[PDB]
Ligand binder design. Structure first.
Ligand SMILES: CCCCCCCCO[C@@H]1O[C@H](CO)[C@H](O)[C@H](N)[C@H]1O[C@H]1C[C@H](O)[C@H](O)[C@H](C)O1
Ligand SMILES: O=c1ccn([C@@H]2O[C@H](COP(=O)(O)OP(=O)(O)O)[C@@H](O)[C@H]2O)c(=O)[nH]1
Ligand SMILES: [Mn+2]
Length: 279
């Protein structure tokens, strides 16, 4: 059950005035594409706070990538779901290397120990993700070699979402780096494909994320038994999944950007969550 919103004063939406004219803001299956200027965060904050929404954030920090945790968590504290309940799940082979980061109220961090792989480390995330049902309402699954630079909030939440890959949002579908070998479960032919989604940021309700990760894990297992590894590993399988199960929101590349690589184009009003230079 969902109680009434309170009285709120904000600018009237204008039917004959689009917010953004420069970009597609709804997919052909009527999912919002989330760009700055498309949402009133005050309305959304009210809607999700009234549900006492808890957001789980999963991140893997294996071997040397423990080095990225401090900046990742400190900036998440400043920018990610502020005002909402947050539960960080840090999966690592080095529990003692996890930095002590001060968390705001209503926010918690769990360290989950795993084994380390010698492709595999990136890939096995689907298996490891696939407790959450009892503890959080939504799950967000991100890369750790990243930092938050601006608001990432409840505007992303929905049953199932993907994020536009910053290198491909302007590309035609034959240019997308999908798995092209019919022998792989991740196969997508040249005349198929909506978008190229980034493996570094996806999520949804716990139920939908578990479905997704289960499906990708099963498909990767089939590929392995067939002696094939998809070209972009888990990302290839994510793309196949979101092709056949359309996401209910798509995040713009504001939500996954690399400023060193790609600068700050006109179409991006904010750079929210960005790659941290590495070697
Ligand atoms: C110099 C790096 C050039 C990479 C630009 C394309 O991004 C890569 O695209 C692949 C699919 O074609 C995979 O998604 C890779 N994971 C992705 O590389 C990452 C790390 C890379 O350093 C950049 O941050 C880029 C945007 O994201
Ligand atoms: O040695 C590794 C390699 C990868 N990862 C995890 O797998 C994610 C994806 O790998 P990488 O980001 O190296 O991705 P890229 O963005 O270069 O494609 C990383 O963010 C980490 O969360 C890790 O923990 N240790
Ligand atoms: Mn990464």
């Amino acid at each position: 059950f969902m109680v009434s919103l309170p009285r709120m004063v904000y600018p009237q939406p204008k039917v004959l005035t689009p917010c953004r004219k420069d970009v597609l803001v709804v997919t052909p299956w009527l999912a919002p594409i989330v760009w700055e200027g498309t949402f009133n965060i005050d309305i959304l904050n009210e809607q999700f706070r009234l549900q006492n929404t808890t957001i789980g954030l999963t991140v893997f920090a294996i071997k040397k990538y423990v080095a990225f945790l401090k900046l990742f968590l400190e900036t998440a504290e400043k920018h990610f779901m502020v005002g909402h309940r947050v539960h960080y799940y840090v999966f690592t082979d080095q529990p003692a290397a996890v930095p002590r980061v001060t968390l705001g109220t209503g926010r918690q961090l769990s360290v989950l120990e795993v084994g380390a792989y010698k492709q595999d480390v990136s890939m096995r995330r689907m298996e490891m993700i696939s407790r959450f049902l009892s503890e959080v309402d939504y799950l967000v699954c991100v890369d750790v070699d990243m930092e938050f630079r601006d608001h990432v909030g409840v505007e992303i939440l929905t049953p199932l979402f993907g994020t536009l890959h910053p290198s491909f949002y302007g590309s035609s579908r034959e240019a997308f780096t999908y798995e092209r070998r019919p022998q792989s479960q991740a196969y997508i032919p040249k005349d198929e494909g909506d978008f190229y989604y980034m493996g570094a940021f996806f999520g949804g309700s716990v139920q939908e994320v578990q479905r997704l990760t289960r499906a990708c894990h099963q498909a990767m297992m089939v590929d392995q038994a067939n002696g094939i590894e998809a070209v972009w590993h888990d990302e290839s399988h994510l793309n196949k999944y979101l092709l056949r199960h359309k996401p209910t929101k798509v995040l713009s590349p504001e939500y996954l950007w690399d400023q060193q690589l790609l600068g700050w184009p006109a179409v991006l009003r904010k750079l929210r969550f960005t790659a941290v230079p590495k070697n």
